[PDB]
């Protein structure tokens, strides 16, 4: 999955 | 000076890495808050004998988004280079792959980019 | 499932061990497999994947330096392991060269590859 | 022989393209069923004077996933080359971008690959 | 749609494009200097009826790097979205492919990213 | 969106 | 090819 | 660099 909590780690 | 140290993206996500003498990158990547649930193992490789012509240092690393608190069933790789000097930087492109069924494999991998510095935002 | 010896269609071969706590460690070599062709591989995988038919997410890196040669470049593979009788690892890769700042825009190639446990 | 023609991927998705003499690609991309609801407009460009040395022909095209029937709020680009020979082929890598909110933009764009030939999969061997 | 107009990246490379009612993008991409030898045909597609929930407008376009003056034997595609606002922006990922021999096809395609605005730098 | 009906067009 | 004059068009 | 001996490792 691509959960929202991963956003910051990807620059987003 | 060098890759070893603490690096930040513009959002304050923070990796702490050691660059070993024979090319290992080892460390952790965590959120700006830095709580335990946010911390993941980071592992990769770099060119330990880069060109001496002003070229950057090629590198890459992976984080699988599982720790002992949660699991996103996904993993990201970053491919890029370290650029030394007064404002050292690591510039990357990334691939984020989710574990998917075979039917959904066509939409398993996102692409993006990010840049890191040693200056805490 | 992941631990073992893998090949692409050209016979390039890596050995990899999927460690207890999510590590991937191994060696990637050419079809000839001479010393000059062998490189360290390190990465990560999901050690507790979903049970619903989903693959196992993973990634790894090889920096193209060993004791014999150095291309001043490194590749990352991002993909998934799919188990069963014909186990496969399907990947997308990024290959980045060390470049000057002027050439950084053309530093990174993209591609794909698939690996199986059967010698071609 | 050449880019102009009807091309298929392994799942039978079908694009019908015309390669104009000065570099335009125009046509349609449809499903293996090929009904109107499955059909989308394609436009792109190609190198109309490729190198004479064994190299392929660079090309690219876009499909926005909207037609008169439905709208996925997304678009794909394919970047690759045409390769002539015994079985001509177009080899590509693609980027599929969804319209997203700014918060979700980091997960807007998928990457992948595909290959096309002029042989319909039902006739393939 | 807001896409029709003149757009610039940070280096001043600039495209002038029309977003037609039929979903077409048509225009010209040129260098910051903008001499005739620098100009190329651009064609693409965009979503002519985007969502009304704050989402961007999906789009893509291609430039083949041939004009009557020069030919790089390559072509680039940009995939991205238009983001409306007080200052509109187009954010993209790109793929640049060269014509190569089969033996060199593995290294035929570069990846990158760029962003454009309507403000000349 | 990335609806399932787009899969075949992307090779999947 | 990827000649240097293309750099600006790609953001570099 | 992207020397030709890397091709096989990249599937080409």
Numbering used by the authors:
A (entry chain H), F (entry chain F), G (entry chain E), H (entry chain C): 1 to 12
B (entry chain G), E (entry chain A): 15 to 135
C (entry chain B): 16 to 135
D (entry chain D): 15 to 139
Paper text:
From these “secondary” peptide families identified in the initial screen, we chose three 5-mer “hot spot” sequences: LAEYH, PAWAH, and FDEWL. We used a series of array peptide libraries rationally designed around each of these sequences to successfully evolve the three sequences to 12-mer L-peptides. The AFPDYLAEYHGG L-peptide had the lowest Kd value, 43 nM, among all peptides discovered in this work. One L-peptide, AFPDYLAEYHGG, showed a Kd of 43 nM—a 100-fold improvement over the HPQ peptide also developed in this study, and 1,000-fold greater than Strep-tag II HPQ. Strong correlation between specificity in the substitution plots and co-crystal data was also observed for the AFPDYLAEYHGG peptide (the highest affinity for streptavidin in SPR measurements) and the RDPAPAWAHGGG peptide (the longest stretch of highly specific amino acids between positions 2 and 11) (respectively). Although these effects cannot be completely excluded, comparing the substitution plots with the co-crystal structures for each peptide revealed an excellent correlation between the binding specificity of the preferred amino acids and their relative contribution to the interactions with streptavidin in the co-crystal structure.
